[PDB]
Please model this.
Amino acid sequence: PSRFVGQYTLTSIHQLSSEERENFLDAHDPMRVYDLNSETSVYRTTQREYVRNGYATGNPNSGAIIALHEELQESPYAQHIGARPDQADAYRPRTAHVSSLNTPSLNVMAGQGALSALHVTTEMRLGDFLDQGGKVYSDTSGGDSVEALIVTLPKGRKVPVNILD
Model:
């Protein structure tokens, strides 16, 4: 199970075959893993002032740590199992500071237990981020049926929000 030690040298999903790349995305891309889409609603708490005109803008200075599902790092279990160095199961996404994206973003919660898990509570349409070039990352910085996400929102862009409380 540990024969491949030192051989887990891949660092990008593009270094994997098409089949393994798809396997990795199936296991780590938030969009696929949590079965998200343009109509998925995402939530976060904030202050009225920031969304008083019905829109929210991305935060330029977040301290969030995100998972990069397109980049690889040896899985802590690769050596425990016999994971081949050219297979998706031998790796896990790399993580990085959100500032590395050089783009404002918003930390949101998604899932049936989101609203519960969570100043005012806002709701947003994931598609509104996506339609404007926003990207979704798992936030690695609740319980079950809820996932923490980081969604980018390019400079000068905004998304409509609904205050729930």
Remarks:
- Helices lie at 18-28, 30-33, 48-51, 114-117, 126-130.
